[PDB]
Design an enzyme around this catalytic site. Structure first.
Site, PDB file in Angstrom:
ATOM      1  N   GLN A  52       5.768   4.063   0.950  1.00 21.43           N
ATOM      2  CA  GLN A  52       6.345   5.337   1.380  1.00 21.43           C
ATOM      3  C   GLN A  52       7.112   5.266   2.697  1.00 21.43           C
ATOM      4  O   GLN A  52       8.108   5.979   2.831  1.00 21.43           O
ATOM      5  CB  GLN A  52       5.314   6.473   1.375  1.00 21.43           C
ATOM      6  CG  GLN A  52       4.860   6.881  -0.026  1.00 21.43           C
ATOM      7  CD  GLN A  52       3.794   7.954  -0.022  1.00 21.43           C
ATOM      8  OE1 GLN A  52       2.837   7.934   0.760  1.00 21.43           O
ATOM      9  NE2 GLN A  52       3.910   8.895  -0.946  1.00 21.43           N
TER      10      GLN A  52
ATOM     11  N   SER B 141      -0.709  -0.177   6.072  1.00 20.20           N
ATOM     12  CA  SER B 141      -1.618   0.771   6.713  1.00 20.20           C
ATOM     13  C   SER B 141      -2.816  -0.012   7.259  1.00 20.20           C
ATOM     14  O   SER B 141      -3.041  -1.150   6.850  1.00 20.20           O
ATOM     15  CB  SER B 141      -2.102   1.810   5.703  1.00 20.20           C
ATOM     16  OG  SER B 141      -2.696   1.205   4.566  1.00 20.20           O
TER      17      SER B 141
ATOM     18  N   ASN C 295       7.348   9.836   8.163  1.00 20.09           N
ATOM     19  CA  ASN C 295       8.100   8.617   7.873  1.00 20.09           C
ATOM     20  C   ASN C 295       9.546   8.687   8.325  1.00 20.09           C
ATOM     21  O   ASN C 295      10.114   7.647   8.658  1.00 20.09           O
ATOM     22  CB  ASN C 295       8.005   8.250   6.395  1.00 20.09           C
ATOM     23  CG  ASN C 295       6.602   8.005   5.901  1.00 20.09           C
ATOM     24  OD1 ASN C 295       5.622   8.068   6.651  1.00 20.09           O
ATOM     25  ND2 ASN C 295       6.470   7.753   4.612  1.00 20.09           N
TER      26      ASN C 295
ATOM     27  N   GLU D  41      14.893 -13.246  19.480  1.00 23.20           N
ATOM     28  CA  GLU D  41      15.281 -13.684  20.827  1.00 23.20           C
ATOM     29  C   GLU D  41      14.456 -12.961  21.897  1.00 23.20           C
ATOM     30  O   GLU D  41      14.079 -13.586  22.890  1.00 23.20           O
ATOM     31  CB  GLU D  41      16.789 -13.496  21.070  1.00 23.20           C
ATOM     32  CG  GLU D  41      17.672 -14.470  20.302  1.00 23.20           C
ATOM     33  CD  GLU D  41      18.379 -15.538  21.117  1.00 23.20           C
ATOM     34  OE1 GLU D  41      18.586 -15.334  22.336  1.00 23.20           O
ATOM     35  OE2 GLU D  41      18.764 -16.569  20.520  1.00 23.20           O
TER      36      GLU D  41
ATOM     37  N   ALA E  46       1.121   3.628   2.344  1.00 27.34           N
ATOM     38  CA  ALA E  46       1.887   3.776   3.584  1.00 27.34           C
ATOM     39  C   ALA E  46       3.079   2.821   3.599  1.00 27.34           C
ATOM     40  O   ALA E  46       4.204   3.270   3.802  1.00 27.34           O
ATOM     41  CB  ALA E  46       0.997   3.547   4.793  1.00 27.34           C
TER      42      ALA E  46
ATOM     43  N   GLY F  42      -7.147   0.554   1.506  1.00 33.89           N
ATOM     44  CA  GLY F  42      -7.775  -0.571   0.818  1.00 33.89           C
ATOM     45  C   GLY F  42      -6.854  -1.764   0.639  1.00 33.89           C
ATOM     46  O   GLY F  42      -7.261  -2.900   0.890  1.00 33.89           O
TER      47      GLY F  42
ATOM     48  N   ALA G 131      -7.505  -0.067  -4.555  1.00 36.86           N
ATOM     49  CA  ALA G 131      -8.552  -0.756  -3.813  1.00 36.86           C
ATOM     50  C   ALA G 131      -9.612   0.208  -3.265  1.00 36.86           C
ATOM     51  O   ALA G 131     -10.461  -0.202  -2.471  1.00 36.86           O
ATOM     52  CB  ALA G 131      -7.940  -1.588  -2.705  1.00 36.86           C
TER      53      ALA G 131
ATOM     54  N   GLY H  37       0.790  -1.225   0.000  1.00 34.35           N
ATOM     55  CA  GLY H  37       0.000   0.000   0.000  1.00 34.35           C
ATOM     56  C   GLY H  37       0.819   1.270   0.000  1.00 34.35           C
ATOM     57  O   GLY H  37       2.049   1.209   0.088  1.00 34.35           O
TER      58      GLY H  37
HETATM   59  N1  LIG Z   1       2.781   7.400   8.399  1.00 33.57           N
HETATM   60  C1  LIG Z   1       2.253   7.308   7.131  1.00 33.57           C
HETATM   61  N2  LIG Z   1       0.939   7.146   6.971  1.00 33.57           N
HETATM   62  C2  LIG Z   1       0.385   7.026   5.731  1.00 33.57           C
HETATM   63  C3  LIG Z   1       1.189   7.112   4.578  1.00 33.57           C
HETATM   64  N3  LIG Z   1       0.349   6.969   3.511  1.00 33.57           N
HETATM   65  C4  LIG Z   1      -0.876   6.834   3.931  1.00 33.57           C
HETATM   66  N4  LIG Z   1      -0.886   6.886   5.294  1.00 33.57           N
HETATM   67  C5  LIG Z   1      -2.008   6.744   6.194  1.00 33.57           C
HETATM   68  O1  LIG Z   1      -2.571   5.402   6.081  1.00 33.57           O
HETATM   69  C6  LIG Z   1      -3.996   5.551   5.825  1.00 33.57           C
HETATM   70  C7  LIG Z   1      -4.268   5.503   4.278  1.00 33.57           C
HETATM   71  O2  LIG Z   1      -3.965   4.199   3.722  1.00 33.57           O
HETATM   72  P1  LIG Z   1      -3.251   4.168   2.263  1.00 33.57           P
HETATM   73  O3  LIG Z   1      -1.944   3.485   2.442  1.00 33.57           O
HETATM   74  O4  LIG Z   1      -2.934   5.641   1.738  1.00 33.57           O
HETATM   75  O5  LIG Z   1      -4.237   3.470   1.157  1.00 33.57           O
HETATM   76  P2  LIG Z   1      -3.656   2.206   0.316  1.00 33.57           P
HETATM   77  O6  LIG Z   1      -2.784   1.262   1.280  1.00 33.57           O
HETATM   78  O7  LIG Z   1      -2.771   2.629  -0.776  1.00 33.57           O
HETATM   79  O8  LIG Z   1      -4.876   1.313  -0.292  1.00 33.57           O
HETATM   80  P3  LIG Z   1      -5.635   1.912  -1.588  1.00 33.57           P
HETATM   81  O9  LIG Z   1      -5.098   3.367  -2.011  1.00 33.57           O
HETATM   82  O10 LIG Z   1      -7.196   2.020  -1.296  1.00 33.57           O
HETATM   83  O11 LIG Z   1      -5.502   1.010  -2.731  1.00 33.57           O
HETATM   84  C8  LIG Z   1      -4.325   6.928   6.492  1.00 33.57           C
HETATM   85  O12 LIG Z   1      -4.263   6.855   7.951  1.00 33.57           O
HETATM   86  C9  LIG Z   1      -3.141   7.748   5.952  1.00 33.57           C
HETATM   87  O13 LIG Z   1      -2.943   8.970   6.659  1.00 33.57           O
HETATM   88  C10 LIG Z   1       2.606   7.271   4.775  1.00 33.57           C
HETATM   89  O14 LIG Z   1       3.377   7.343   3.851  1.00 33.57           O
HETATM   90  N5  LIG Z   1       3.095   7.378   6.042  1.00 33.57           N
END
Ligand SMILES: Nc1nc2c(ncn2[C@@H]2O[C@H](COP(=O)(O)OP(=O)(O)OP(=O)(O)O)[C@@H](O)[C@H]2O)c(=O)[nH]1
Ligand SMILES: CC[C@]1(O)C[C@@H]2CN(CCc3c([nH]c4ccccc34)[C@@](C(=O)OC)(c3cc4c(cc3OC)N(C)[C@H]3[C@@](O)(C(=O)OC)[C@H](OC(C)=O)[C@]5(CC)C=CCN6CC[C@]43[C@@H]65)C2)C1
Ligand SMILES: Nc1nc2c(ncn2[C@@H]2O[C@H](COP(=O)(O)OP(=O)(O)OP(=O)(O)O)[C@@H](O)[C@H]2O)c(=O)[nH]1
Ligand SMILES: Nc1nc2c(ncn2[C@@H]2O[C@H](COP(=O)(O)OP(=O)(O)O)[C@@H](O)[C@H]2O)c(=O)[nH]1
Ligand SMILES: Nc1nc2c(ncn2[C@@H]2O[C@H](COP(=O)(O)OP(=O)(O)O)[C@@H](O)[C@H]2O)c(=O)[nH]1
Ligand SMILES: [Mg+2]
Ligand SMILES: [Mg+2]
Lengths: 132, 432, 432, 432, 433
Positions: free
Chosen positions: C15, C132, C220, C246, C12, C136, C91, C10
């Site tokens: 990234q 995340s 991040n 461990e 998150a 999705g 998603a 995803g």
């Molecule tokens: N710490 C952090 N949180 C993130 C990041 N990207 C998204 N989020 C958080 O995670 C949630 C969003 O999930 P996403 O990862 O963006 O959606 P996805 O995993 O790509 O799934 P889909 O886009 O629906 O296909 C929210 O709480 C966002 O603020 C990131 O790079 N770092």
């Protein structure tokens, strides 16, 4: 008192003599068997080996069956995992198919609602188209 | 969901849609030839969403212009931008619906329906990715309300896994074109509630009232009403055009906006309200344009926001402004107005901040709200319908076209069902 | 020997993954392609025939632009093509979409690339899944990936890095739905799970790093520091730098109770504080201070089942031992009756490495805390309430059911959380 | 009864065995190449017990180095004495036990068990008259506690008429933060009580308690504590290792030390206690030498000698003094405190005097006692076990490896049975 | 002819053997090979070979090799006939059952078919001289088995033993009383006579006489050898008393069970304390009754006597010997049992007291040995039985014996023999029928 000498024997490399200081105070009556026999000694040794070589062999009894118990517990370690991994694939394949026949059913239910509209858009021109 | 094919329907739809293309192009920086002329690099941000990559340095819009009358099909090309659209997608009609839904949805619509439903699979098939299709149509006339809903139902049958977005510029007696309007609207609302994934309810009465009262135009022209209408469209489609990452997708918007299938009619709100092709402006700062979400004088649908409850809200901020203050003042309109936001849907109000502002507007605010208050709009149309239908008046225009009396009864019933559904969740509480 | 596969799923996952690999390479001195001329780091990064350091990681997202941003961005070509797996449509912040709909098309392909890196390992320990909770894919796809890996790899280790949803940062209304749904289907799978609350981290880079509006890059950059601290022990070998597996033992006493609480100190920005140095004692009590922790909850009002203290760089045992004695005396930290034990200490030789173009400041000594506390249930309690609030009226449920999901799957998922809350509530009790 | 086969197990067992070998080779006079360099010719005719007669003017030690981790298999050979051992006697696995008994005694142990059982086969087949087997292993970790006891059980099954000697360096919470240690120890103590002929109980709490107070050092590592154990080992390794006839055989020791089969755990005592760095030089007298090895402060097992009764005692003197005052002090320390020696075993305390003595400092004494006080050590471990076990904590780490809950209950039960057996003969009087 | 077979069993038996045979070489002149510098009675201990050397008629047996290898590498290697020394691989680990039932069983048939061949070279063999320890595995296990087999293989042949009583002061194992009681019970009927030597009693006459604080077995055995080579006075050299080994049962042993005489030796001379006057009789004759110069820790001031044999080595005339007896008989705490008279069968041997040249003991002109069967020997058995009962009450180390196949009842039966033998030595002190 008297020191009576009997004079035992005489030889080239030494001599000997008996001395009686006081006379003996007493003179009286006391003043299965078959011992030893090889067959009984070899019987008591054979029987000793019979129990010694038993104790160590009976020690192997508690060690060999415990060792083949470690073999069944390590076998159990895999067969419980294999009967879990089977159940994991069994649920997943059933659930993935469950979601297939769930959404593919509503898609046909959708293309029935917006399919009966074509039947209505066939009854309309049937109710229409009048030259009279 | 990745690329959107636009469709224009009827006199209104073709005019509002053209005026949308007129304002959307000068935001991205597209000249009337098709080519790009914009300043920075952040305008052609995956332009393949609304504009098709043409045979060279050109970018032709992915729009399908449809009308049963040639009147609107010889107007916009002679005017501004109009030369931009591809020639083949101009699906002409010589006959005409004549502000009749039954003629548009059945009689005259049937001949041109299959014709328009062959020019899009030569547009959506040429799309390496596909979001869905957005339709600009009125609910008052014959072509928009009738044929438009027929295309909606036909493409939903052909493309079931896509989002059906709509700009439903519904009728008002304050700016009416025909007596039959409540019939046309009710019949199409019934079609909309069943066949669209999401709909922007553009109430003609609201546009008229902001023109006549706020803008204070003694005689409001269609152009004036359409000016605000296009300004609202730019503001709403903002996410679907820039890298905002806040419901910037057609599906992501729907999943964040519609909690119950039938409740997908959005009450759009735009601020500040500007007079067509003028306004020097005093400019409204972050606190000054935030609270204008409760002020009904800023609603594009004639429904008081304080009368109902917000199920889901999508706030868009266009122009350079500190986002730190933009959310801060956006937060205050919740903790001081908690009554109008459903407790059962946590964090239901979502904010977006971009760099691209609208036409002359240096800073703007656009509130896409799913308020239970929209029931007031449908009530009005139902009241307007039951007036004529109780008299069983003008029904021979429709019955003569092949339609049945029951067909009206279900369209009416399904609409009053929707009102009660909106009232159902308005009276709903999160217990405790 | 002792390889570890890092799976990033995803927006998150990808990234936060790219932000830590930026730090992982800086912990050794690796260039953006693999250049590091004249170990223990080969556990997390493999070596090719050319003489370069190839990654033993895999990035997956049903949307392309996120992964495209890393395959074109700064840290380019340190990786080969195969492992940066992508789909076309996302998603759309829907669990059922990422788990059953779009995810299904990419599952076998990821579980085809999954061994053509696992086969390049002499003996891998397990996996490091980065995802995340509200996304999705982060919810849907991860769950499916975790489920399928338990069949494909069996009893093998799975240590996940979950990103707990925060309202202030950009989210979706359905985030608690995706959060509950994913955990329920990943409890029987996943040996350990480190949660990171976006609110808790947003707070510290605003209250300790003074950035009023922090972007994911800033967010991040902090997450990376804690993941680099959690790892390190397998990427380096000090005097007595304890292995994570461990002390995973020390942290997970029961299969369902595998959620440790991450804490980091010191948290100082590049601007000012060149002076003061920072004492060995101050950082140790900061671990118990609810301000510096990754998950929002009160450990003061909860029982301690484990306490793993990890240290970096300039640290001596006598100062650490005395610092632990001061927390035992001066503080009332309610430790559970069944384990004493107390704290599992681990000092790492590597100095605290920071991003040169980042925001955090270079310090002599750094500390990380793992500790399994009853207080983590308070984070689940927040999520379950939000879920029950929406589920009561079945809000957005139709989006999930539409992708083929059963309505009972929601009630079953809540029943797991209802049991897990009771499980965390039971482990405090204390015997007769 | 003239040859022995040494086995090293795990990190501890190998980091002690090599330290015992580097002290005993230096005790006789063999350089790190294999060749002899010693002064006299008297210490020569006794190397054949622990060392093999190699292909020339060199002697290879009869040691089998075993560990599931390569970490301890690439450490001592690069250090001082390491290349002296035969290459094919380095039987080491790659995937370690991970401080888990079930992993070491069952899972990872099974693959390498039969492999080491063939190395011990070859070394004992090349033996003219084998005494028995001595194992250096810890009871805290997984390789020593787990695999070590598995070899012990397997060897005992293959060689029933040989003595099983052990250096059981059992765990303490004062030196190690690994939580599972009481489980590891209890499970192996149960194995030890049933499968070893004689055991030297090396309590790491006791040598930890040998820190600074009147022990010289505040900051230890392991080697500093390993200095004491190797000195205690080399202290024992002067009976069947030097020409002196006392308990100069593995069986003769057992018949003089173990009166009841299960009571074969010896509390070792060494004096004078010297720090690794500092030296006592020209000090320590014969009555002061006798006084030390009978008090708690000199015990290598954390049990007060006055808290129980000595069943059998073996006193060893490494000092070229007159054996008159050496035994004169022996039959005067027991007349003063006859309470702590069982009346029912006449002349139970036996003294031995050797003519070397050490090199560091002329005075040396080692005590081997079979005190009923050792029950205190097992009580501690049982108390540590019943703490975690009363609620079934960390049990999944064992149950998951295939083990059963009852397997723990018998290991626990059999140990508390041993403590009651030690108390049984402690309360026993020679009255009737 | 006459002849005597010397069987040495265990570590003590062997090491005490290579002490007797050394003091059996310097008396005659027999140099380490077997050659003689040259009466007529030395052949009772040495056999003439085809080459010319005099091989000693003896047999050394130990379940452990290094102890016998010591003699095989030593100067007297060529003295004893190459195959004469029998050895096993593993010892009896200070366990009776090990030396008697298990490891001894493997070597038993080999030893009696070996004694067989050296006994066939005898033209009217007297009997045997068995040398063993009481506390070892072998010596107190194998000896017992060897003795019960010599009674089947040789029958009515008189065999005497030289037992080494255990002392806590020297080496020792905790199980020594167990091994001590077990051996006597089974060897009592298969032994015609038994000379006990307490290690404590000989250890408490070396520092106080030879002036040696911590002595070794070499010093210990050097003293034992002198008494054994005083007991074999007429056996080694044509005397008048003790000429045959049956002439030990007759003069001493009154009842089959009562067969334990008390050994005493005088003078106890060292080679350090300058040069003192040659003190003859009426000075060293009273030393025999002094409990200091004895081989067994006994006090015959309470124990009722049976018989005496005052053996002499050196130039001593009967006139001064019976004058020395007159000085000692006048007012003393010594009394004989009613039925047996105050009859000391005194004997003198003209041969001078021979000493080890590289030893610690000095050359004296006259030496005396005294054989006495006293009731006081029971308080040496009483010492042993108490220690046994102390350990057996809680069954300490019993599992080591039972493990080698021994019955638990075999211990109780062995103690019952000692309980009867103590009563046998006790019941003698009554007047009289
Ligand atoms: N710490 C952090 N949180 C993130 C990041 N990207 C998204 N989020 C958080 O995670 C949630 C969003 O999930 P996403 O990862 O963006 O959606 P996805 O995993 O790509 O799934 P889909 O886009 O629906 O296909 C929210 O709480 C966002 O603020 C990131 O790079 N770092
Ligand atoms: C690996 C074996 C060792 O000899 C033992 C400790 C560990 N090492 C390296 C030195 C060291 C120590 N502590 C470290 C922490 C981080 C990095 C290194 C160290 C060590 C020391 O300071 O050498 C002088 C030490 C450690 C402990 C230690 C003492 C100590 O000094 C020798 N304590 C005895 C234990 C401890 O668990 C305990 O039981 O004491 C009550 C104790 O727990 C407390 C405070 O309650 C304490 C610190 C006192 C805290 C948490 C848990 N750990 C586990 C062991 C314990 C400690 C010594 C060497
Ligand atoms: N006087 C004397 N006593 C000895 C000698 N050797 C051993 N002893 C003593 O006899 C007892 C020991 O018996 P050992 O002879 O050494 O044992 P063993 O006969 O060899 O039987 P194993 O070694 O168990 O096979 C203890 O009292 C020792 O002190 C010796 O040479 N001379
Ligand atoms: N805002 C706006 N509303 C319009 C416009 N044209 C018509 N309407 C309204 O929509 C209805 C007429 O629909 P229309 O599209 O013109 O007829 P059609 O061509 O048959 O679809 C009436 O309610 C009008 O008030 C227009 O240009 N702008
Ligand atoms: N005295 C001593 N104890 C050690 C040493 N190494 C480990 N230990 C202890 O023994 C236990 C760990 O056993 P270990 O051998 O390291 O694990 P293994 O390799 O799986 O057998 C813990 O209680 C440690 O305190 C060492 O070198 N010396
Ligand atoms: Mg995403
Ligand atoms: Mg011996």
């Amino acid at each position: 008192a008297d020191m009576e000498v009997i004079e035992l024997n005489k030889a080239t490399s030494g001599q000997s003599w008996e001395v009686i200081l006081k006379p003996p105070s007493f003179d009286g009556v006391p003043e299965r068997r078959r011992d030893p026999s090889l067959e009984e000694i070899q019987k008591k040794l054979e029987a000793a080996e019979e129990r010694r070589k038993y104790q160590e062999a009976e020690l192997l009894k508690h060690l060999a069956e415990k060792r083949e118990h470690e073999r069944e517990v390590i076998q159990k370690a895999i067969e419980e995992n294999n009967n879990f991994i089977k159940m994991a694939k069994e649920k997943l394949a059933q659930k993935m198919e469950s979601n297939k026949e769930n959404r593919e059913a509503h898609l046909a239910a959708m293309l029935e609602r917006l399919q009966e509209k074509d039947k209505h858009a066939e009854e309309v021109r049937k109710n229409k188209e009048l030259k009279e | 969901m990745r690329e959107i094919v636009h469709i224009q329907a009827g006199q209104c739809g073709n005019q509002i849609g053209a005026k949308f293309w007129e304002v959307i192009s000068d935001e991205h920086g597209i000249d009337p030839t098709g080519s790009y002329h914009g300043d920075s690099d952040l305008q052609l941000e995956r332009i393949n969403v609304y504009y098709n990559e043409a045979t060279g340095n050109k970018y032709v819009p992915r729009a399908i212009l449809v009308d049963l009358e040639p009147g609107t099909m010889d107007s916009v090309r002679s005017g501004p931008f109009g030369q931009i659209f591809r020639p083949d997608n101009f699906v002409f009609g010589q006959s005409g619906a004549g502000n009749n839904w039954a003629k548009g949805h059945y009689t005259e619509g049937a001949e041109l329906v299959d014709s328009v439903l062959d020019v899009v699979r030569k547009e959506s098939e040429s799309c390496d990715c596909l979001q869905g299709f957005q339709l600009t149509h009125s609910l008052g006339g014959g072509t928009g309300s009738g044929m438009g809903t027929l295309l909606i139902s036909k493409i939903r049958e052909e493309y079931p896994d896509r989002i059906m977005n709509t700009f439903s510029v519904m009728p008002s007696p304050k700016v009416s074109d025909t007596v039959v309007e409540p019939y046309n609207a009710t019949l199409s609302v019934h079609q909309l509630v069943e066949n669209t994934d999401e709909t922007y309810s553009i109430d003609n009465e609201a546009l008229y009232d902001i023109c006549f009262r706020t803008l204070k135009l003694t005689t409001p022209t269609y152009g004036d009403l359409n000016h605000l209408v296009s300004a609202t469209m730019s503001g709403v489609t903002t996410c679907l055009r820039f890298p905002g990452q806040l419901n910037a997708d057609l599906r992501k918007l729907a999943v964040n906006m519609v909690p119950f299938p039938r409740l997908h009619f959005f009450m759009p709100g735009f601020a500040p309200l500007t007079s067509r092709g003028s306004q020097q402006y005093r400019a409204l700062t972050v606190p000054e344009l935030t609270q204008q979400m409760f002020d009904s004088k800023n609603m594009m649908a004639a429904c008081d926001p304080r009368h109902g409850r917000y199920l889901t809200v999508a706030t868009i901020f266009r122009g350079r402004m500190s986002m730190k203050e933009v959310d801060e003042q956006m937060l205050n309109i919740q903790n001081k107005n908690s009554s109008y936001f459903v407790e059962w849907i946590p964090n239901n109000v979502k904010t977006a901040v971009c760099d691209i502002p609208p036409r002359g507007l240096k800073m703007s605010s656009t509130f896409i709200g799913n308020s239970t208050a929209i029931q007031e709009l449908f009530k009005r149309i139902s009241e307007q319908f039951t007036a004529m239908f109780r008299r069983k008046a003008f029904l021979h225009w429709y019955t003569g076209e092949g339609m049945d009396e029951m067909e009206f009864t279900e369209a009416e019933s399904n609409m009053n069902d929707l009102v009660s559904e909106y009232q159902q969740y308005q009276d709903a509480t999160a217990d405790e | 020997m002792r390889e570890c596969i890092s799976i990033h799923v995803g927006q998150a996952g990808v990234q936060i993954g790219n932000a830590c690999w930026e730090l992982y390479c800086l912990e050794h001195g690796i260039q953006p392609d693999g250049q590091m001329p004249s170990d223990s780091f080969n556990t997390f990064f493999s070596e090719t025939g050319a003489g370069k350091h190839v990654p033993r990681a895999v990035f997956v997202d049903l949307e392309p632009t996120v992964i495209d941003e890393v395959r074109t961005g700064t840290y380019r070509q340190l990786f080969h093509p195969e492992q940066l797996i992508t789909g076309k449509e996302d998603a759309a912040n829907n669990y059922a979409r990422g788990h059953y709909t779009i995810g299904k098309e990419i599952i076998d392909l990821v579980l085809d690339r999954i061994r053509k890196l696992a086969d390049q390992c002499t003996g891998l320990q397990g996996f490091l899944v980065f995802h995340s909770f509200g996304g999705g894919t982060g919810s849907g796809f991860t769950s499916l990936l975790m489920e399928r890996l338990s069949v494909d790899y069996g009893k093998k280790s799975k240590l996940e890095f979950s990103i707990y949803p925060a309202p202030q940062v950009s989210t979706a209304v359905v985030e608690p739905y995706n959060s509950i749904l994913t955990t329920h289907t990943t409890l029987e799978h996943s040996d350990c799970a480190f949660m990171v609350d976006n609110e808790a981290i947003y707070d510290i880079c605003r209250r300790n790093l003074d950035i009023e509006r922090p972007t994911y890059t800033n967010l991040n950059r902090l997450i990376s520091q804690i993941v680099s601290s959690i790892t390190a022990s397998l990427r380096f070998d000090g005097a007595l730098n304890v292995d994570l597996t461990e002390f995973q033992t020390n942290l997970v006493p029961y299969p369902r109770i595998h959620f440790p609480l991450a804490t980091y100190a010191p948290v100082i920005s590049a601007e000012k504080a060149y002076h003061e140095q920072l004492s060995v004692a101050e950082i140790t009590n900061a671990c118990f201070e609810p301000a510096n922790q990754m998950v929002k909850c009160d450990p003061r009002h909860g029982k301690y089942m484990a306490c793993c203290l990890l240290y970096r760089g300039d640290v001596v045992p006598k100062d650490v031992n005395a610092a632990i004695a001061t927390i035992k005396t001066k503080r009332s930290i309610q430790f559970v009756d069944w384990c004493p034990t107390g704290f599992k200490v681990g000092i790492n030789y590597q100095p605290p490495t920071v991003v040169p173009g980042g925001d955090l400041a270079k310090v002599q000594r750094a500390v990380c805390m793992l500790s399994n506390t009853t207080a983590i249930a308070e984070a689940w309690a927040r999520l379950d309430h939000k879920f029950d609030l929406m589920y009561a009226k079945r809000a957005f449920v139709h989006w999930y059911v539409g992708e083929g999901m059963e309505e009972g799957e929601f009630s079953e998922a809540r029943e797991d959380m209802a049991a897990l809350e009771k499980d965390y509530e039971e482990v405090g009790v204390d015997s007769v």
